[PDB]
Design a protein around this nucleic acid. Structure first.
Lengths: 117, 110, 120, 56
RNA sequence: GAACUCGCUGUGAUGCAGUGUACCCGCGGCAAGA
RNA sequence: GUAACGGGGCUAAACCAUGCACCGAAGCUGCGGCAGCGACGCGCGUUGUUGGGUAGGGGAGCGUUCUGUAAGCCUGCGAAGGUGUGCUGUGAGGCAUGCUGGAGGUAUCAGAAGUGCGAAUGCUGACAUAAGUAACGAUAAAGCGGGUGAAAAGCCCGCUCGCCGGAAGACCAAGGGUUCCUGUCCAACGUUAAUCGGGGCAGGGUGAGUCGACCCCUAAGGCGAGGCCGAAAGGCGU
RNA sequence: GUGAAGAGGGAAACAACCCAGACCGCCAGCUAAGGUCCCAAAGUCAUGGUUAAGUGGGA
RNA sequence: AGGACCGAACCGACUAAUGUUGAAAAAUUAGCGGAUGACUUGUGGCUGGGGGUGAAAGGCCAAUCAAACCGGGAGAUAGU
RNA sequence: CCCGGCGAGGGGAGUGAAAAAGAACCUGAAACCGUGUACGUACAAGCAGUGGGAGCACGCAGGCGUGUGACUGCGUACC
RNA sequence: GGUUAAGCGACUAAGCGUACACGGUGGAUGCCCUGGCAGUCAGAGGCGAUGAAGGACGUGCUAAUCUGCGAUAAGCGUCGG
């Protein structure tokens, strides 16, 4: 029996083109271009799921450094003091506190100053 | 009531007719006829008859008044091509597209 | 360039231009009104109006000078018999140019050029 | 002379940005007949500045 | 092949790194590069 | 073209030594999940350990067309196909559903393959790009009035102008095969428009004792009764 | 040893150097090389010296 | 008288430009050579593929020639 | 019947279950070409994506969803 | 409230990009079968000088082509259905 090979290929092509919506020019219309673009976008998504937690750690550190500098202590000394104070707040919460409640942040800095002596 | 008039399989490429069509898009029907009468392009005489037919269609078939109509929509679509063979130098043959177009005019009081 | 130059080539050589205006000058005098392209109607002013001035002074020398520039004794007769006396008291400006739209075949701008009086 | 890469439709559209012709700004009205005509041109019915210039 | 298609220096170059410069889009030319 | 710190810039923000912090990977730890293998208690529960990967080897699957299941089952209260959306599987996929479509489809389980491709050679159709760019086929030449017509630079009529005149005129053969004439038509064809045309459609038109062919006669040469040659095909020739 | 058949971090860029070998997800933590004045996450940190040549930062 | 001389038709294609997706799968323009002869041309015939023809160019033999074209052996055989 | 050239083509009307079944006629994909709407875009440099992400428009108790993507980290097309 | 100065600052889209909606082009796909393809089983194994195979021309109320026919020309006689 004869098997027409278009139908499965067409269905596979449609899926790629559906995933390439929003891309520029031929990358959103032409399968030969869309397929490579869709695959590459997956590689970046896999790559940038790791960079994401890197970039947010930079952001958390940068804000904690700024807020800590606002209270007369560098980021390096602030973290060291917090560890000596048995404080287990991570950078994500520290950046959340630094921006939303600067009074609670000063309490942490004062507590960090204490553990340093 | 929007009224439509069409000129299908017009002997002109859509690129040339669009130059004229963009001149009257959104204009009042009275002003559109003036612009087309004094446009020195073959597409202007083609577009004129489509626009004049639409005005007549609105009057007779829809009852609309000529003093209210404006060209709400006008677009030119690519029509089927008639393919011709032209002999070139050294026995090479090129295919010439006798391109056609579809001219559509929509006039309404609103 | 063409700083301060006069005359239009009109995509023709001198022999073709001179013949073409000689033909058209005769037609204008014959009918008193013709339809032609605006560039040609403007260049025709420089050919027909000088002829009408010759007609103001009727002499054998003038009629032979008008015949050399028109080569039509029919036109020469009308020049010195009708147009001459008609424009005797008019100092120049014997012709009028009226724009009348565009030619269908090539979209050339058209104009009527007529004699000022036309007995009307 | 030959093109290294095909121009895209976006650049094609931009080149045509200046290909649109001009609309008729506005016409004048003949003093006698009142018909609309090109400025400084005689009317379709042979009128110009209130004078019947040509036959028909 | 697809383009959102600058120069310089470096590196084994419209496309990498650094740096400089550059409002958007056509038209007629010149042919240094592609 | 600074270009021989990555740059700014630095008298340390340079170099050496010591210390404590901190930053820093997909490494390690934390929490959730999946799988392979081995332990066990009963496919199921925990547990230990492993899980970069091309060629290649091994295991488990999905889908396409066709056959039996099938005189079954789904279906005009809408089949296949097309186009969206949602749910679902690690995935190849599957299901449901809106619009379109207007009559077929095929569960399950076995079986058979013209059974899975963006770039082997390519092949067929369609459509872009450059691009409304090049080009519009001899630089012998047109101007105007009138007519026709929806529309006239190009058709018709007229008057001027120009070109050929051992040809760009006239008459035939070869070849073509109705292109001839008239009426009518302008979709396509004509490198532009066209009312015009060697275009479309219809009708008409080719009259021979003397022209030509046929016919009689032969040239080169062809065929060739018998005949010579050759196993034959056939070769030669009166 | 690296790659071929291994990504990640570092050396400005980097084929073969250094750290290290990616089952998946998390906007959690500690470190490796290498780093902490700005570009650019972290010391304009502490102590003792040296250099005046912008040596450092090709000779 | 002349494989004589000058020179149109006619034949050729030495030269130069233009053309080179050309008007033309070799042409045009302006020069040039031959132009009563070993000239040129119409019509018909004959010579056929390792064969024909060749004043001789491995030229020509239907825009295909250091071995024509078509069909067949044949889906021949042959690589990164 | 109407516009048009006693055209082409179209708009009505009518036929039919259906005319988006109208002869260029079942279904009508993709490339390709447009019109409309939303957002972005005229001081901004390179495989055009990816991570973060404002604003705008719309759809749903304050944020979420869909479209768009200013700015910013990373980023040597595929065979 | 007014003026001046300083700072900051939206509203543009000639075009283009993305997304969606609606179209045009195009003729893929599905559905269809008076066509093919490969077999099995039989039949007949020839037609022609009583003019074959294959054609040309003609043949209608017929302008063309197809089928049939052959100056008796989409047919004639006869016997059956």
């Amino acid at each position: 029996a004869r098997v027409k090979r278009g139908v499965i290929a067409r269905a596979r092509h449609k899926k790629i083109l559906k995933q390439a919506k929003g891309y520029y020019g031929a990358r959103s219309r032409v399968y030969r271009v869309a397929f490579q673009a869709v695959i590459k976008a997956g590689q970046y998504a896999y790559r940038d799921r790791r960079q994401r937690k890197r970039q947010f750690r930079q952001l958390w550190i940068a804000r904690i450094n700024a807020a800590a500098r606002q209270n007369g202590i560098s980021y390096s000394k602030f973290i060291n003091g917090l560890k000596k104070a048995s404080v287990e707040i991570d950078r994500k919460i520290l950046a959340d506190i630094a921006v939303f409640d600067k009074v609670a942040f000063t309490a942490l800095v004062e507590k960090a100053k204490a553990a340093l002596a | 009531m929007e009224t439509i008039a069409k000129h299908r399989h017009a002997r002109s490429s859509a690129q040339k007719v669009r130059l004229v069509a963009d001149l009257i898009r959104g204009k009042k029907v009275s002003q559109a006829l003036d612009i087309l009468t004094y446009t020195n392009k073959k597409a202007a005489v083609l577009v004129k008859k489509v626009l004049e037919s639409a005005i007549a269609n609105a009057e007779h078939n829809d009852g609309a008044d000529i003093d209210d109509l404006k060209v709400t929509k006008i677009f030119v679509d690519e029509g089927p091509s008639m393919k011709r063979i032209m002999p070139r130098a050294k026995g090479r043959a090129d295919r010439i597209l006798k391109r056609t177009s579809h001219i559509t005019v929509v006039v309404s009081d609103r | 360039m063409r700083h301060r130059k006069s005359g239009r080539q009109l995509n023709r050589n001198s022999s073709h231009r001179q013949a073409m205006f000689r033909n058209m000058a005769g037609s204008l005098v014959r009918h008193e009104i013709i339809k032609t392209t605006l560039p040609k109607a403007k260049e025709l002013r420089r050919v027909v109006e000088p002829l009408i001035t010759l007609a103001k002074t009727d002499s054998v020398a003038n009629r032979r000078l008008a015949f050399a520039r028109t080569r039509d004794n029919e036109i020469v007769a009308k020049l010195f018999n009708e147009l001459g006396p008609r424009f005797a008291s008019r100092a120049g400006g014997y012709t009028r140019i009226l724009k009348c739209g565009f030619r269908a075949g090539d979209n050339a701008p058209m104009a009527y050029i007529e004699l000022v009086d036309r007995s009307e | 002379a030959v093109q290294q890469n095909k121009p895209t439709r976006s650049k094609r559209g931009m080149r045509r940005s200046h290909d649109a012709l001009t609309a008729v700004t506005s016409l004048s009205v003949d003093k006698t007949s009142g018909e609309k005509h090109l400025r400084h041109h005689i009317t379709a019915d042979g009128y110009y500045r209130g004078r019947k210039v040509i036959a028909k």
